[PDB]
């Protein structure tokens with residue numbers, strides 16, 4: 001029923017109401033999902049692009065764009081609990097908001113805007129619901145093909161890009177050859193940066209950026225060159241990928257249930273195979289609450305606190321919500337040694 005929102009629906013009134021919060025951190029993608037015949041990704045990407053006049057700027061037809069997004073959305077596994085199209089929509093919509101932050105006003109080109117939103121949308125496509133390390137230890141075709149390096153993240157790129165070639169799917173058809181090679185380079189860089197094994201190198205570099213930042217007379221970050229811009233961008237996308245815990249508790253509890261169920265599903269495959277069970281993946285032993293606090297203290301808060309620095313005072317509410325959600329889980333509970341599970345799970349790579 002009628003694609004002005006690019007999707008079928010029987011509650012355009014409630015879909016519209018919900019898309020009023022398109023530009024806000026508080027948008028509810030679960031609701032957009034429920035009012036779009038579970039096409040949250042197609043729906044939110046279609047809204048974001050009209051909102052940013054991106055289809056105009058890059059001469060992308062509504063049909064080309066809906067045809068591609070639909071296909072991209074088809075390539076997220078609906079039987080995977082967390083890494084399905086709801087996640088991709090969320091990260092896309094979250095990048096859209098981060099891009100609007102006042103400290104970054106007019107800092108990026110339209111091409112960079114396009115790349116960052118596209119990267120967010122494709123960053124987990126065709127995710128099988130198991131980790132890089134799982135794929136490597138079981139000798140998956142994907143691990144062989146990509147030499148055990150950012151295996152899934154290489155696959156998300158191949159797939160997202162491959163789908164441009166489907167009939168009526170080339171949303172970049174009208175870019176210049178130069179724009180296209182620049183977009184490809186930036187998206188590759190951003191999607192590779194969503195590999196959690198890089199989290200600590202990302203974060204160290206973001207801290208250096210923070211410590212020597214410059215802001216204009218207005219109050220807006222001064223980003224000297226390409227190198228500085230793509231670095232903010234790769235951090236922005238990693239932040240969006242890690243934004244679940246900074247969202248209202250109503251939303252984060254749902255994201256938590258989902259990733260826990262996907263972790264448990266990997267653990268069962270590990271148990272079934274006689275493998276050691278990855279951290280947080282053993283349903284018989286996991287403790288969500290304890291894990292929440294550790295994950296927020298060791299991974300999420302250190303990052304968002306640095307992003308909040310970069311763009312101060314813009315991200316203060318984000319940081320506040322994050323601290324409230326942490327204390328919510330903490331209250332249910334009756335340091336390096338303690339962080340060891342996260343280190344094992346994320347496999348931080350030295351550089």
Ligand SMILES: C[C@H]1CCc2c(sc(NC(=O)c3ccccc3[N+](=O)[O-])c2C(N)=O)C1
Nearest residue numbers: 194196241242244255256259288291292295
């Ligand atoms: C106790 C739970 C709470 C939520 C959570 C985790 S781990 C986690 N996220 C990740 O592990 C993650 C983050 C960035 C990129 C990839 C992943 N991942 O592969 O799961 C979340 C979350 N909702 O983002 C542990």
Ligand SMILES: [Mg+2]
Nearest residue numbers: 123124194195
């Ligand atoms: Mg990923």
Ligand SMILES: [Zn+2]
Nearest residue numbers: 091123124241
């Ligand atoms: Zn993701």
